[PDB]
Enzyme design. Structure first.
Site, short mmCIF file in Angstrom:
data_model
loop_
_atom_site.label_atom_id
_atom_site.label_comp_id
_atom_site.label_asym_id
_atom_site.label_seq_id
_atom_site.Cartn_x
_atom_site.Cartn_y
_atom_site.Cartn_z
N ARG A 197 5.97 -29.11 56.09
CA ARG A 197 4.71 -29.57 55.58
C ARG A 197 3.11 -29.33 56.81
NH1 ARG A 197 5.32 -33.23 51.22
NH2 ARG A 197 3.07 -33.24 51.29
N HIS A 247 -4.80 -33.89 54.46
CA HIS A 247 -4.92 -34.50 53.91
C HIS A 247 -3.65 -35.18 53.63
CE1 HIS A 247 -2.01 -30.92 52.00
NE2 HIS A 247 -1.63 -32.36 51.01
N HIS A 253 8.70 -38.24 51.45
CA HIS A 253 8.21 -38.77 50.34
C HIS A 253 9.07 -40.43 49.94
CE1 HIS A 253 4.55 -38.15 47.71
NE2 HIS A 253 5.17 -36.75 48.00
N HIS A 303 0.72 -43.36 51.99
CA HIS A 303 0.00 -41.99 53.01
C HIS A 303 -1.01 -41.06 52.85
CE1 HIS A 303 1.72 -39.32 49.87
NE2 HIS A 303 0.52 -38.23 51.02
N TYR A 337 1.66 -26.48 46.35
CA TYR A 337 3.71 -27.03 46.69
C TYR A 337 4.37 -26.23 45.39
CZ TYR A 337 3.22 -31.02 43.01
OH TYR A 337 3.30 -31.79 42.08
N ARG A 391 14.60 -31.00 37.50
CA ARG A 391 15.36 -29.96 38.47
C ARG A 391 16.01 -30.38 39.28
NH1 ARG A 391 15.10 -23.78 35.34
NH2 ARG A 391 16.12 -22.98 36.56
N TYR A 430 13.38 -32.58 42.04
CA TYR A 430 13.00 -33.55 43.01
C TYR A 430 13.43 -35.04 42.48
CZ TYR A 430 8.76 -30.47 43.55
OH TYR A 430 8.46 -29.35 43.83
N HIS A 435 17.23 -34.99 41.96
CA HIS A 435 18.65 -34.95 41.31
C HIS A 435 19.11 -36.18 42.15
CE1 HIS A 435 22.56 -32.67 42.35
NE2 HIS A 435 21.60 -31.25 41.34
N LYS A 443 -17.27 -18.20 25.71
CA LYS A 443 -18.17 -17.55 25.98
C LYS A 443 -19.61 -16.77 25.82
CE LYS A 443 -16.67 -13.11 24.48
NZ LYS A 443 -16.04 -11.62 23.89
N1 LIG Z 1 -11.60 -1.43 27.27
C1 LIG Z 1 -10.52 -1.76 28.00
N2 LIG Z 1 -9.98 -2.66 27.57
C2 LIG Z 1 -8.56 -2.10 28.18
C3 LIG Z 1 -8.19 -1.06 28.41
N3 LIG Z 1 -6.75 -0.93 28.46
C4 LIG Z 1 -6.49 -1.77 28.67
N4 LIG Z 1 -7.22 -3.14 28.61
C5 LIG Z 1 -7.50 -4.32 28.22
O1 LIG Z 1 -7.67 -4.89 27.03
C6 LIG Z 1 -8.38 -6.31 26.58
C7 LIG Z 1 -9.19 -5.88 25.52
O2 LIG Z 1 -10.40 -5.94 25.75
P1 LIG Z 1 -10.87 -5.30 24.16
O3 LIG Z 1 -10.73 -4.02 24.80
O4 LIG Z 1 -12.26 -5.68 25.11
O5 LIG Z 1 -11.63 -5.97 23.04
P2 LIG Z 1 -12.10 -7.04 22.91
O6 LIG Z 1 -12.54 -8.18 24.10
O7 LIG Z 1 -12.20 -8.14 21.79
O8 LIG Z 1 -13.98 -6.66 22.36
P3 LIG Z 1 -15.06 -6.83 23.72
O9 LIG Z 1 -16.63 -8.05 22.60
O10 LIG Z 1 -15.61 -5.83 24.62
O11 LIG Z 1 -14.67 -8.71 24.56
C8 LIG Z 1 -9.49 -5.85 28.20
O12 LIG Z 1 -9.92 -7.21 28.80
C9 LIG Z 1 -8.74 -5.32 28.69
O13 LIG Z 1 -8.89 -5.73 29.99
C10 LIG Z 1 -8.97 0.07 28.18
O14 LIG Z 1 -8.49 1.69 28.13
N5 LIG Z 1 -10.22 0.02 27.62
N1 LIG Z 2 18.88 -26.26 37.11
C1 LIG Z 2 18.91 -25.37 38.79
N2 LIG Z 2 18.54 -24.12 38.70
C2 LIG Z 2 19.51 -23.90 39.50
N3 LIG Z 2 19.49 -23.61 40.67
C3 LIG Z 2 20.01 -24.87 40.35
C4 LIG Z 2 20.03 -26.27 39.38
N4 LIG Z 2 20.51 -27.57 39.44
C5 LIG Z 2 20.92 -27.37 40.68
N5 LIG Z 2 20.90 -26.86 41.50
C6 LIG Z 2 21.90 -26.33 42.70
C7 LIG Z 2 21.86 -27.52 43.32
C8 LIG Z 2 23.35 -26.88 43.84
O1 LIG Z 2 22.80 -26.11 45.13
C9 LIG Z 2 23.98 -26.33 43.42
C10 LIG Z 2 24.86 -26.02 42.23
O2 LIG Z 2 24.91 -28.53 42.15
P1 LIG Z 2 24.67 -28.98 41.03
O3 LIG Z 2 24.87 -27.65 39.46
O4 LIG Z 2 23.72 -29.87 40.48
O5 LIG Z 2 25.79 -29.41 41.28
P2 LIG Z 2 26.29 -31.44 40.97
O6 LIG Z 2 27.40 -31.06 42.22
O7 LIG Z 2 25.47 -31.46 41.09
O8 LIG Z 2 27.62 -30.51 39.84
P3 LIG Z 2 28.31 -31.53 38.91
O9 LIG Z 2 29.59 -31.95 40.59
O10 LIG Z 2 28.72 -32.60 37.80
O11 LIG Z 2 29.17 -30.07 38.69
O12 LIG Z 2 23.12 -25.71 42.17
#
Ligand SMILES: Nc1nc2c(ncn2[C@@H]2O[C@H](COP(=O)(O)OP(=O)(O)OP(=O)(O)O)[C@@H](O)[C@H]2O)c(=O)[nH]1
Ligand SMILES: Nc1ncnc2c1ncn2[C@H]1C[C@H](O)[C@@H](COP(=O)(O)OP(=O)(O)OP(=O)(O)O)O1
Ligand SMILES: Nc1nc2c(ncn2[C@@H]2O[C@H](COP(=O)(O)OP(=O)(O)OP(=O)(O)O)[C@@H](O)[C@H]2O)c(=O)[nH]1
Ligand SMILES: Nc1nc2c(ncn2[C@@H]2O[C@H](COP(=O)(O)OP(=O)(O)OP(=O)(O)O)[C@@H](O)[C@H]2O)c(=O)[nH]1
Ligand SMILES: Nc1nc2c(ncn2[C@@H]2O[C@H](COP(=O)(O)OP(=O)(O)OP(=O)(O)O)[C@@H](O)[C@H]2O)c(=O)[nH]1
Ligand SMILES: Nc1ncnc2c1ncn2[C@H]1C[C@H](O)[C@@H](COP(=O)(O)OP(=O)(O)OP(=O)(O)O)O1
Ligand SMILES: Nc1ccn([C@H]2C[C@H](O)[C@@H](COP(=O)(O)OP(=O)(O)OP(=O)(O)O)O2)c(=O)n1
Lengths: 458, 458, 458, 458
Positions: C51, C93, C102, C120, C195, C252, C254, C256, C403
């Protein structure tokens, strides 16, 4: 109003309305069609991201760092104008990349136009001026409390550097604002953090650096006679680990053999397609692929689309480039003959690469093999791996402070830290390839290589 | 039947019925109440895991490695009997830890009983015999095709080592089975991979090693008239990165200053509580905390519960131990005075730690300070950091194979790999603590320490 | 000074010095020895958390939500006193949980002392007073700008509720502060978010709720005549998904089956050990396990240590409890006979659980089976699953804003949202177990159950 | 030989040499330039992935499922020929997607050519035939033990379905092989698992389904008179949660308002660009964008490159398409007027969408507003959300088995499971947009909409 955008790396990013205005332009939307890693996508299928989201992330991190600095130290007097300027500089720091990112300004431009010096940061400055002047952003900047005459120079200086206090955007009591987006002193800045996280998320490699911890312990101290950003004295191990991570990333991903050879073939295809593809610029004026870096309107239309334009072409004159690209598509690549052991003593300079194939070809193999190769059958690629500052310990240029006295910067020597740290910070290796697939050509080339490597003690 | 268990690190683990039988015993369920990191839980609140899930993971990984080896090379003749034996050995390799894991056999036993040599692997062997003989597992082993007289010796040898071919469990053509769970030659085994992943998941630190890539490229070759496990010749950088990761983990988590001092205070309280607590063993005979390692029935009842038993006690004779534990609970700790610069040249041996406080106390502070301390007011802790093999390069004892000839093992020298690797593989540092912590016993203690570190060139 | 702590869920958490003072007390450190999920650790081996870290996370999230609300709406007039009070309320906090969380106040206390009503949260209030009055925190609170007479009552009212405006800690213009830590109206608060994230990180299950997006779109509006927290009108699907996630978690993990039966056996062992274990309270006064909730000093010493104290005991009078715990240790569990189909029409009340076993036993199976069981051979467990508000749609008690008009709150009916939402919000099912392991007893019990479930339309 | 690829979702994937041969063709490499989510990249900047990696993942998962089934049930007689055929079918299941994936065959083709009924699975079959016949894979298949005459028909039937026992690739005792890649009965297959995981990884949303647990508990039983795949009887809640996850994904990402309107504008631009762009096919014959689905050679060259070809064009005749795309680039989108409450009672059929704008326009708003709109000023979009089987409960078509009798398949009704499940499995809503950005047109359109929604009880 305020807008939100969902990032897979940083989560929900919040964008000031002026940033929203800047983002919705053709010059900025061009980055949706330029890949971050270029030819690494053909080795790592997960690296399909572009420069657009990287720029968003860099802007967000720059904002976060400035906000943390301002909250921690109210005496620095950071205003919201500075926050907006830093965020804008972080947003547009990479506007100047060409097709396939680092390929364009690392391999193609030097070979296509050797008489000029060009980097993508100069292009970023040029494109930033073009964007601002073409999309009418000057009144909009004036509307939110910015002074463009000063703020544009400040942003330019943040992106490319100075154009004793050499800067002009901000006075000498705001020096720490020039280390946030681009750090030219020790190389610690949010850009590295961003591409670390993003390339590790996409490539499938694991990352090490924790930049949130670094931001927690960052402070501004009066080093020498100008304000700087200093780390807590117990973060030295983490800094060394960060540089080790950068080296590992470069070695594993950014200098992969097959990715580099694929980049070589793409560059060769683009060199052959030059003088046949055309781009239109300002005033109905025509330009080449290599000469497009002279007109920004023509450069705005230069993206990775040229690859598919060449591949799907039908013109008779683009036949050879089409052949090379089709060769890529079938995975018929130039083969790998052998590398050279790393060495920090003997160094090959940038002007000496054009002769290495001749040296390899003009050898006398001891054994008797009939198949003989020419100097055009070899590609030699040289890789430089360092800690970002040409064999200087970058940690030697970092300031630290102690908990007892947080307003006093100090220096930490390597011996004070540990004995398991590296002793030198740079090296160099050489790779040799062959453009012949015959089972006998790969033996002849290896025999040629073991006689050129065991000639100069490589 | 076949049972399934959900792991947060490896996912769903599948267990053979004999393993289920072995797991459901008091001797094995004792591990639910022993913590993995001991006193590191009071610095890193996320490290609340126990040895139970670590043992499950080690067993699962050993099974996976054996299965991959058997699938890749059918000519090795791995049977299911060998798979079950290796899995059982991986399951029961840490049955022998006492309360707070490494603290018990690293700090307490040497101080409590200096006349004996005891390690938790010997205890694991003793507890394995106790479990098997007490829970009637011999017929169950016989039921699934195992030959206990041979397989028990094989498992024991896997756990603790030999009890020219020195082993007896398996013949010389099955040598590669003795380096899966515990590797006493180069220190590469599934145990390290498991605790790397688990401690990085719980502590909140990021991991680097990819053991799945390592399992992909693993092979069995005949290295010098003996079968061994060999890596692909391009995994050397990954191996070096793995050892760097282990060093970083130790430095950052396992040797934290406050965690070590908390362990020191717990050991002191346990030493004071000795000769007053009772443990009942076989035949109703009584035992101490220190002498419980002579009877396994009494050892089965020795867990982290002793901490709360001492804390919640009311007997007059446990007053001092109660005081020390209550001191821990209020965060009134021994304070930190200073450390010594690392050095791998001059070494302090195991027998010399009992005199260091005397040396620190018997100094001559140059400045004039009144408060004078005694030899009982200082705690000196000495930390040894290496690559696991006493300043020998562990990569020098690894075999590699090439893709062209996968059946031939070769050696790779460090210089062939890179120049940014570490030059030495061990070091040592010394930490000094103060036990008065009032207001000025720390200034006096710091003066004493600076006048003692300059008296021997530390 | 300010302190930092590294959390695996939230990263680096920053703690105000007063919070540090409150945390370093025996009453708060007691939470290091109480498990979050109780008996779920014996099914999910990854759920070993306590923590302590949950309370830290809840405090941090409450601080974050208050800070965001204050930043977004400067007109609410949130002061730093309110931020500290809310953080303290979020920290304490759950001070009142007993052994196995928990289980104590969900199964044991009702069975041990049916004549009292105890939760807590009342224990949390009692322990908060015990802590404050025993550790001298009153001047420390006075030192940082708090007014204890008002703030202690405010914190109490936040933890347990009122002790027309019924509250006393804050006036009616600060109503939205009473729904940050504990929300008695619709059950939306940072405790659930915490977190959710922590149990999904540890159990190995995946989470879906994004609380950062929710914090982004949160606002304070005047709904009837009092300020409340309102969501954006397009977050209704996300709210419904959050409640679906909570239901999935409960089902996935919290509830398990095996975890619940293990909890039942632990409760039975503790009931048998009652009247034989003793706890010392204020004034050398002796107390029972069940009567320890009357003296806070004796309650401070009641943790999961009682389990191991009973297991390792030797007194003749604790024999039956020892037998039940040893039964758990061998995995000789009560078996599962069958469940009942869920039904939200016929409801069993808390007063019929004591009689259900007699109803199950006093049946007359149609077919002939010799083995006959008694009413003491069955355990019946009743499980209630709802959306937290006793078959009331919790979304019906949430206010939303548009805007276009962000200052007007509105209501959203379920039919307006979607047609694939659930129609009812509660249900109930019944599980039956058997304390007999014979291969024939499990058949007799199944026949008894099929003849009892078909006797009341279950 | 065997080859390995590093995936960010599944890790390291092994590829059989025949799969490597199939992958290295232009027809398969075309998928590197087709995006998974089409127009969702302009709302979610992290979704930049293509169909190439998705196809790799689907193939890998199909291989895994077949391997597990064959491992836990040796009596099914799965051969390696079947494993290769299933893997190939999983690799090439989406060869037929057009530019922007679902946009092409959902919005464009029906509007461009209403006389044909075309789906991307028919295109996948056509492209698979073209690939095999064009790249000389027939002898290579013969080399590894496949019988092309039967195996090609088997693969085609797996991809598109039948071309009592209606199938021809395999006999009736291998029925369970037809529901691994594509399940046309209950809709449970590895394709859904793959795109779930990948879209959740890239979009930045969290996932629920655990397909590894599902694979653990999967078995083959004889349900009516043919072998099928059955789930354990306690996985019903997990199945229901999976379908809830699919619904949540569709709602949140795949039917975003702005993404759908951007898709509408792209489709309109492509309709205007038709009759002006040309594609070259077999024999030098020319084709349109809409008529390219008649010649596979011309279809091989149809990717997302058309977007940038139209955007960067200079021909006078493509002016309107260029205008629409430039409108997208500035974020000047059609506006959202209002939606309709969901109702699964009165369905709007496929043939009725062409007159809805006329109905909306031909209304008589009660209040007086001067601005009047036409039927060409409205776009109406109709969204159908179900559980994939047209308002039929998909769990009603799943077979389950019990642990006691694993060879007997049973049915589970919804009432037996829970009462908080949804009662209906389909619904429909209608969205209305306006192409007149203004301050009065957006009020007039809303007034027209509140009079058309109240004229039919929507
Ligand atoms: N102006 C401009 N924006 C760019 C460019 N490249 C990427 N962008 C991004 O693309 C987004 C598109 O927005 P704009 O081109 O200003 O079009 P718009 O927002 O509808 O026009 P505004 O009325 O000025 O807000 C912008 O927020 C930029 O962050 C560039 O070369 N020129
Ligand atoms: N969705 C997920 N994404 C990533 N990792 C996960 C996910 N679910 C579980 N894990 C982790 C938990 C373990 O570290 C490892 C395998 O566990 P898990 O797949 O839950 O097997 P398990 O022992 O609970 O099931 P079983 O015996 O039914 O196959 O992967
Ligand atoms: N046996 C056993 N299971 C455990 C343990 N820890 C976690 N589990 C998991 O908890 C789940 C509970 O299953 P069991 O303990 O076997 O109970 P059961 O499944 O009802 O009993 P069976 O009839 O054997 O299937 C198992 O599937 C395990 O995966 C443990 O220590 N022992
Ligand atoms: N005080 C305290 N720190 C904890 C606790 N649990 C984990 N920690 C962390 O452990 C670290 C150890 O620091 P301290 O306990 O304060 O010891 P210290 O830093 O040497 O003592 P100081 O002089 O106060 O800095 C802290 O930085 C906390 O972040 C706890 O329960 N109480
Ligand atoms: N063949 C192939 N490999 C890919 C592709 N995409 C990513 N890769 C990976 O990129 C790596 C590069 O290896 P190859 O392309 O085979 O080049 P190579 O290994 O030098 O050539 P080999 O002599 O066949 O080993 C492979 O190991 C693949 O895992 C792809 O589309 N085709
Ligand atoms: N390298 C690290 N990476 C991640 N977390 C770390 C690292 N080092 C320590 N931590 C954890 C330990 C604590 O939980 C929290 C802060 O502890 P730490 O920085 O060591 O403070 P401290 O109390 O030891 O030092 P001091 O009082 O000197 O500032 O972070
Ligand atoms: N030889 C290289 C260099 C870099 N990259 C890629 C990897 C990174 O993701 C990205 C670096 O981003 P930049 O274009 O901004 O380069 P920087 O100059 O900012 O990198 P650095 O931090 O070293 O200065 O380029 C690459 O593919 N190959």
């Amino acid at each position: 109003t305020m807008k939100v955008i969902n990032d897979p790396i940083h989560g929900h990013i919040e964008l000031h309305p002026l940033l929203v205005r800047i983002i919705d332009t053709p010059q900025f939307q061009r980055l949706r069609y330029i890949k971050q890693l270029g030819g690494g996508y053909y080795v790592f299928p997960g690296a399909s991201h572009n420069r657009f989201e990287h720029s968003l992330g860099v802007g967000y991190l720059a904002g976060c760092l400035v906000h943390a600095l301002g909250e921690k130290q109210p005496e620095l007097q950071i205003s919201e104008r500075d926050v907006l300027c830093v965020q804008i500089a972080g947003l547009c720091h990479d506007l100047g990349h060409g097709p396939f990112s680092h390929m364009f300004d690392g391999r193609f431009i030097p070979l296509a136009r050797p008489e000029v010096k060009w980097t993508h940061e100069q292009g970023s400055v040029m494109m930033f001026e073009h964007l601002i002047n073409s999309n009418g952003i000057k009144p909009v900047m004036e509307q939110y409390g910015l002074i463009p005459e000063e703020d544009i120079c400040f942003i330019k200086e943040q992106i490319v550097g100075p154009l004793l206090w050499p800067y002009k955007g901000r006075p000498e009591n705001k020096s720490f604002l020039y280390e946030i987006v681009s750090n030219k002193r020790n190389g610690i800045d949010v850009d590295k953090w961003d591409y670390f996280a993003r390339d590790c998320h996409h490539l499938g490699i694991q990352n090490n650096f924790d930049y949130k911890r670094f931001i927690k312990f960052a402070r501004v101290c009066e080093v020498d006679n100008e304000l700087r950003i200093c780390a807590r004295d117990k973060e030295v191990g983490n800094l060394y680990d960060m540089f080790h991570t950068r080296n590992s990333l470069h070695r594993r991903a950014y200098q992969h053999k097959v990715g580099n050879i694929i980049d070589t073939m793409i560059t060769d295809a683009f060199l052959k397609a030059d003088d046949y593809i055309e781009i239109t610029g300002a005033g109905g004026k025509k330009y080449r692929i290599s000469t497009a870096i002279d007109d920004m309107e023509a450069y705005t239309k230069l993206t990775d689309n040229i690859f598919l334009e060449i591949l799907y072409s039908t013109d008779p004159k683009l036949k050879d480039a089409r052949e090379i690209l089709k060769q890529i598509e079938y995975r018929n690549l130039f083969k790998y003959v052998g590398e050279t052991q790393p060495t920090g003593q003997i160094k090959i300079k940038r002007e000496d690469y054009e002769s290495l194939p001749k040296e390899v070809a003009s050898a006398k193999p001891k054994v008797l093999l009939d198949v003989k190769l020419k100097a055009e059958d070899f590609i030699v690629d040289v890789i430089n791996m360092d800690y970002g500052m040409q064999e200087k310990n970058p940690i030697d240029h970092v300031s630290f402070y102690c908990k007892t006295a947080p307003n006093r910067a100090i220096r930490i020597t390597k011996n004070q830290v540990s004995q398991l740290l590296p002793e030198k910070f740079a090296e160099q290796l050489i790779r040799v390839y062959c453009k012949k697939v015959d089972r006998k050509s790969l033996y002849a080339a290896r025999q040629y290589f073991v006689q050129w490597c065991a000639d100069r003690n490589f």
